[PDB]
């Protein structure tokens, strides 16, 4: 299928990635840069993020979902359902509202596209209605991350997809902070795209620190695999 080819020929080996985020949460301004690489053959992402404006005013875990679904591993039998690659290289817009239970919300707009050989994710994030001293602005979330299925459905009237899912962030006292994700993606270009059957992406995420890094930062290792169409 020459449409599948086109995505194949783009994601076949290791692809360098760049991520840029401008954020404002309750007027706490910050910028983040990230660099790394993805290998969609294995559903594998390796990234390192740096707060270039000093201290990050929110917990690193709360930004993981914001900081590359085109790197998912789609099994051979599911290749007709891979919206994200099909949009490349012109790319897609990924927009979310993230509702933190009993706290504020993030609203994010990203453009994910190639710039030459490099796969770029440029994001603007606005946070509003956060509690000063809540779990987010009060830095009460553990530096870890749970595995999670993400359910994708076609958004046929918009030539894109809708994605809906819950993330539970471990709080230091042993409880959990719900972050309810609402997501829409739409191609940037005017060309055709693969609109998928309902399926899900399986995520695992591991957060660590670079021992030689003095700046505020996050090392993220992610594996992502499409499933749910046998």
Structure, explained:
Helices cover 6% and strands 50% of the residues. It is mostly beta strands and 230 residues long. The protein has a single domain, classed as Green fluorescent protein (Green Fluorescent Protein, Beta Barrel). The two termini are 20 Å apart. 38% of the residues are buried. InterPro entries: GFP, GFP-related, Green_fluorescent_prot. This is Green fluorescent protein. Belongs to the GFP family. Energy-transfer acceptor. Its role is to transduce the blue chemiluminescence of the protein aequorin into green fluorescent light by energy transfer. Fluoresces in vivo upon receiving energy from the Ca(2+)-activated photoprotein aequorin.
Keywords:
monomer, 230 residues, mainly beta, Green Fluorescent Protein, eleven-stranded mixed barrel, 6% helix, 50% strand, luminescent protein, Yellow Fluorescent Protein
From the N-terminal CA to the C-terminal CA, the straight-line distance is 20 Å
- Helix-strand sequence: HEEEHEEEEEEEE
Largest sheet: 11 strands, mixed, barrel
Q: State the oligomer.
A: monomer
* CATH architecture assignment: Beta Barrel
The strands making up the biggest β-sheet line up spatially as 1-2-3-11-10-7-8-9-4-5-6
CATH class: Mainly Beta
Strand content: over 45%
Compact overview of the structure:
A hairpin with a 5-residue loop joins strand 8 and strand 9 (176-187). The protein has an 11-stranded mixed barrel.
